[PDB]
Amino acid sequence: EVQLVESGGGLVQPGGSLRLSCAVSGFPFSSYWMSWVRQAPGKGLEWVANIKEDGSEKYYVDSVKGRFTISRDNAKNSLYLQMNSLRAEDTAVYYCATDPDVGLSDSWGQGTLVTVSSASTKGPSVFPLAPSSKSTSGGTAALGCLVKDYFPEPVTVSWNSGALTSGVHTFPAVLQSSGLYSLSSVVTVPSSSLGTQTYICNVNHKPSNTKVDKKVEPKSC
Amino acid sequence: EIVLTQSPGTLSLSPGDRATHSCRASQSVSRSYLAWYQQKPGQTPRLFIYGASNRATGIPDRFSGSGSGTYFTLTISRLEPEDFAVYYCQQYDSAPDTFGQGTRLEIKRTVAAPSVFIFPPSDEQLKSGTASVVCLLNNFYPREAKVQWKVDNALQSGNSQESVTEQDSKDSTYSLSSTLTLSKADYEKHKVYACEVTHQGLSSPVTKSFNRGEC
Numbered sequence: 001e002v003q004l005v006e007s008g009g010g011l012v013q014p015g016g017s018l019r020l021s022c023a024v025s026g027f028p029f030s031s032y033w034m035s036w037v038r039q040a041p042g043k044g045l046e047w048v049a050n051i052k053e054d055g056s057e058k059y060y061v062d063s064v065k066g067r068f069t070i071s072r073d074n075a076k077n078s079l080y081l082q083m084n085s086l087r088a089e090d091t092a093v094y095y096c097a098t099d100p101d102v103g104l105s106d107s108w109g110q111g112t113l114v115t116v117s118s119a120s121t122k123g124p125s126v127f128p129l130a131p132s133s134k135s136t137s138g139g140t141a142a143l144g145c146l147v148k149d150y151f152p153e154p155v156t157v158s159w160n161s162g163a164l165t166s167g168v169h170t171f172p173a174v175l176q177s178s179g180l181y182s183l184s185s186v187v188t189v190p191s192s193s194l195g196t197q198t199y200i201c202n203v204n205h206k207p208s209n210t211k212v213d214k215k216v217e218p219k220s221c
Numbered sequence: 222e223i224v225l226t227q228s229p230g231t232l233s234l235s236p237g238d239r240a241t242h243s244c245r246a247s248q249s250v251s252r253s254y255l256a257w258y259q260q261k262p263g264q265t266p267r268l269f270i271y272g273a274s275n276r277a278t279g280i281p282d283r284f285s286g287s288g289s290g291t292y293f294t295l296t297i298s299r300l301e302p303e304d305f306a307v308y309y310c311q312q313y314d315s316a317p318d319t320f321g322q323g324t325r326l327e328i329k330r331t332v333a334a335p336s337v338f339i340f341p342p343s344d345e346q347l348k349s350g351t352a353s354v355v356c357l358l359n360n361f362y363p364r365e366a367k368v369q370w371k372v373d374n375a376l377q378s379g380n381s382q383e384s385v386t387e388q389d390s391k392d393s394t395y396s397l398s399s400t401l402t403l404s405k406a407d408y409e410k411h412k413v414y415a416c417e418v419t420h421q422g423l424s425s426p427v428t429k430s431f432n433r434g435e436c
């Protein structure tokens with residue numbers, strides 16, 4: 001199977017640098033042009049740079065010329081982006097991206113978010129959104145977790161370690177005035193289950209190495 | 222640089238409809254090295270068409286591409302509910318390998334009113350000086366909805382934020398969260414917390430409310 005796995009992103013000070021790595025397998029990497037493409041939050045895709053299969057020719061968007069360098073290690077089936085003198089305009093998800101002539105739909109990596117900010121990493125506070133008479137009709141109650149005041153993106157939320165899947169809605173994070181993010185994750189479940197079944201949201205904020213499990217307790221009269 | 226302009230910016234069509242996405246180049250694209258990508262919200266783009274008219278691996282027959290020179294199209298011959306995305310064209314004949322600005326395709330469905338739920342602040346959160354009050358609008362269509370917060374009957378401005386999920390891949394609905402943020406102090410100044418929802422699917426607006434401190 002085709003896999004392209006980026007690493008090396010995250011939070012970085014303005015004026016600082018990051019080294020992005022991308023490990024590729026499942027197709028003949030060393031025979032293709034490769035590229036980096038980025039996407040600033042809420043914006044479109046923007047081509048950043050590309051490189052010939054043997055590394056001997058490469059191109060860059062003018063906004064990064066002289067401070068970003070694309071390179072590859074064909075022996076290690078890997079692609080790199082060395083990024084210097086970073087600015088807020090560089091904040092984006094960075095994707096390694098195969099030349100489209102490869103003709104494979106799954107030819108880009110998962111992406112790594114780069115956040116150019118002077119702020120510290122900060123883990124979320126996780127609060128229950130408790131099921132009550134105000135979130136329950138028919139045989140279904142809504143409950144959730146409020147994942148509040150973290151930085152930077154992203155967080156992941158699961159329910160019951162991934163066993164609970166249907167009826168889940170994890171909302172896009174919103175940036176508060178404070179400069180911290182907040183998000184809710186909710187789920188609708190059977191009302192009958194509420195006495196018997198435990199509902200636990202599993203929150204992971206890798207940037208701060210914060211993991212929280214919060215059990216969400218019902219309200220009854 | 223070759224500049225790619227996509228049209229329309231936004232497109233809303235039902236399952237079974239034919240969708241057409243246009244990509245115009247400021248100069249001719251040699252070798253028809255013109256690609257199309259599908260991007261779902263918050264996910265990696267997938268390559269759908271390369272060389273103007275070739276389907277990528279795993280791409281179903283309902284997706285096709287055509288064109289040459291300065292005019293290209295991506296067609297979805299028969300829409301399926303899982304086909305909502307932003308679609309981007311890209312030229313890769315000569316660097317910079319620029320992208321168009323994208324067409325956002327929404328899948329249209331019949332009107333669906335939201336179910337409305339309200340969640341007071343947790344005692345945990347209250348310990349720490351802030352109160353978040355959450356209103357959930359679940360499984361509705363179209364996306365446009367108005368949420369108005371009222372505390373002891375006065376409507377709020379500037380202290381709430383909303384977020385919307387991507388469309389459901391089977392039933393094409395949205396959900397929306399609206400969070401009202403008050404200082405724990407200011408929370409205590411008032412009693413009735415209400416979320417009032419206006420939506421095309423509701424015959425009249427719906428209010429969901431609680432009194433500060435109840436079951």
Ligand SMILES: N[C@@H]1[C@@H](O)[C@H](O)[C@@H](CO)O[C@H]1O
Pocket residue numbers: 033050059099254313314315316317318
């Ligand atoms: N300048 C082009 C690149 O931008 C292109 O993607 C690659 C494959 O066409 O070949 C180079 O000659």
Ligand SMILES: [Cl-]
Pocket residue numbers: 045046047318319320
């Ligand atoms: Cl671009």
